[PDB]
């Protein structure tokens, strides 16, 4: 994405929300160049707080 | 209200612009037939049972590399060449040269294996060494011609390694042309872009 | 007054597309074997291609006769610098699209108003379908009509450099293609592929039927992968040539991904802004017919 | 030496045909090829 | 765009004329200077070409 | 050096040039030498390439790294900022005269 930096990277279910609304109303403009990726994936959890004490 | 004519100011521009082009015209031409390539003094180590005057195990200093190869490798935007280091794979040199466009690799620390050492012979990838006191402490070998007690030292070219369709004039017909002149200085080439004026 | 036996004008020795290289003259098939490529990890995925618009431009009344064929090639693979061409007599084509017209399309690449004496021309019936598809190329620079000069190129790279193992899935890894060269190279193939008689090909695509279309696409999927390669180096970002010991390679930066300005400058063929709209209008129109 | 030598000795011999070392014009100094649209100067088909 | 390469500061059209001129300067018939001359005594004459 | 690589750097711009040679045209003709072995410095070789001249390029490297020492010295009161800029018109002019 560093070398590319021109397409917005939606994440499967993130892309479907546009598909659910594009059929709800035809004739509406969206960014044409799109990439869909499922591989995130998963890992460790971490922990923190920014409070006092 | 008076409105000035466009023709009188438009004529001044095309005149000052035409003078500039024919001004530096002869200057840029000699700097094109030349600029083909030069210098970079490297030595090729003749390995094996002395069955060659040119083997392929060549190397230069980190000093010579800092004033000839480094500047040009920044005009053409490339990732710098990877370090051999030691225990490196005989394809890591290949993996680097792919995106580098020019055969070159940096330094040697812990003596490399005789699998990567062979690779450097055919591809002509030159290894820049920070030191020059001794070299065969950093190669594992079958023991032939290695013992530092000579290597036929000559000169390289910027005309060979580093070819770009533009900026380095690479036509061998003119490489043949360039290999004839009686070794120009800075004053010889200056009077050359001077006689061509009048 | 040549005719086609449903073999098509391409099943003929009258006009055949051959590149010259290697000290002798060779067919496109022999050339492409030299193009070897790797991967650089930016996934170039196949999008959908939007259908063209039916409206045909009007061939504004014109006396004399223009070389309709000339411009088709003189824009796509034109080597010598071509200036703005968004304007021009580029749609006289549509004057062949109507049923009974007298205007005929000769061999060599001209469009006569009236068939004249001693001039061999394509068959008046099969040149009709070629027009009802390509005369549509007249409006190539009309705003609200022009194609998109980005996504089609994804389609292009999956063609000349896509191993079938990939196209059957619709996705492939961006490639960097390098073959072995000689002197002029890239510029030499252009001065060469220009004079090819492109009309002798395109006519066949819109006529020949399923029997002789499956067989046509099999013998000519290479004449297409030739005028598609040159058309591609007019886009690639770099042309830097790697060096072996005595050998020279013409690494091409990123085939199939479209930038906006030529890597060639001096080394290869070059496009212009007015031509970027044109190549997208051709590449889009032709793919639906082919694929 | 003598590389720029198109042809030689333009006289016919006393009794025999060809006067020894006699060169005939090259078959290319006498060929007009039509120009291409992009290309400029090319020879004849030969076949 | 223009600040990418220099083109040796030469013109675009004038750079293409260089390509055709670089063929004239290397033709086998124009190179008329010769190197090396072997000295030997064999006094016997026919004029010849070479 | 331990904690001043910044100084042990420019403290290398005094490095000797060329090669040392064992003069033979004196020992072969039996000229009296007060040293056991006849030796000398050269002291800067000659031209090796076509248009390189490494001796001129070595000086160019000195000018390059010696410029940063001047183009870093954080000064105050302005009058040195006046001479801090007009010194490169002497620092670069001199290197062109050298070539």
Automatic annotation (TrEMBL), chain A:
It comes from the Viruses. This is Structural protein VP3.
From TrEMBL, chain C:
It comes from the Viruses. This is Viral structural protein 5. It comes from Bombyx mori cytoplasmic polyhedrosis virus.
Automatic annotation (TrEMBL), chain D:
It comes from the Viruses. This is VP1. It comes from Bombyx mori cytoplasmic polyhedrosis virus (BmCPV). The chain holds residues 1236 to 1282 of 1333 of the full protein.
